[PDB]
Amino acid sequence: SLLPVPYTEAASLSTGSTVTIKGRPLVCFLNEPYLQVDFHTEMKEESDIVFHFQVCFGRRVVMNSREYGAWKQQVESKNMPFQDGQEFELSISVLPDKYQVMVNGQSSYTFDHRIKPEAVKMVQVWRDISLTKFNVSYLKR
Ligand SMILES: OC[C@H]1O[C@H](O)[C@@H](O)[C@@H](O)[C@@H]1O
């Protein structure tokens, strides 16, 4: 809807930064829609990924990083706070030791930094969703 998907935005992250994403799945969970959020080191899609967050609605969540063109140790979670056919609010906060992911205001996943957050230069949100809001908090030094 509001914003185009794939959605790409140049960004700068550091401790205290928050990325808020608002959207909804394009189809019911039965058809297994996906949602993917990648924090890139460069403005290009082929660049490395500091934090890869992929949701298979109703199934699982996978997190990883792509370093020097290679995927690393994948982390899998079965925690599924997302609701079928519902708008969701996803917020990713940058803590000193890791990323904390909140879904609709509830802590749901964390991922220890593998690469310093300062290496991020772009964020891309894509797959099967309509995007209504994308915001990066630049209120701290
Ligand atoms: O999430 C999908 C993507 O990240 C995983 O963590 C890795 O195993 C990659 O091989 C895979 O292509």
Swiss-Prot record:
Region forming the signal peptide? none
User: Where does the UniProt annotation locate this protein?
Assistant: Cytoplasm, Cytosol; Cytoplasmic granule
* Sites marked Not glycosylated: 135
- Which function does this protein serve? Regulates immune responses through the recognition of cell-surface glycans. Essential for the anergy and suppressive function of CD25-positive regulatory T-cells (Treg).
**InterPro entries, per database record:** ConA-like_dom_sf, Galectin-like, Galectin_CRD
Residues in Galectin domain copies: 5-137
Primary residence: cytoplasm
Q: What is this protein called?
A: Galectin-10
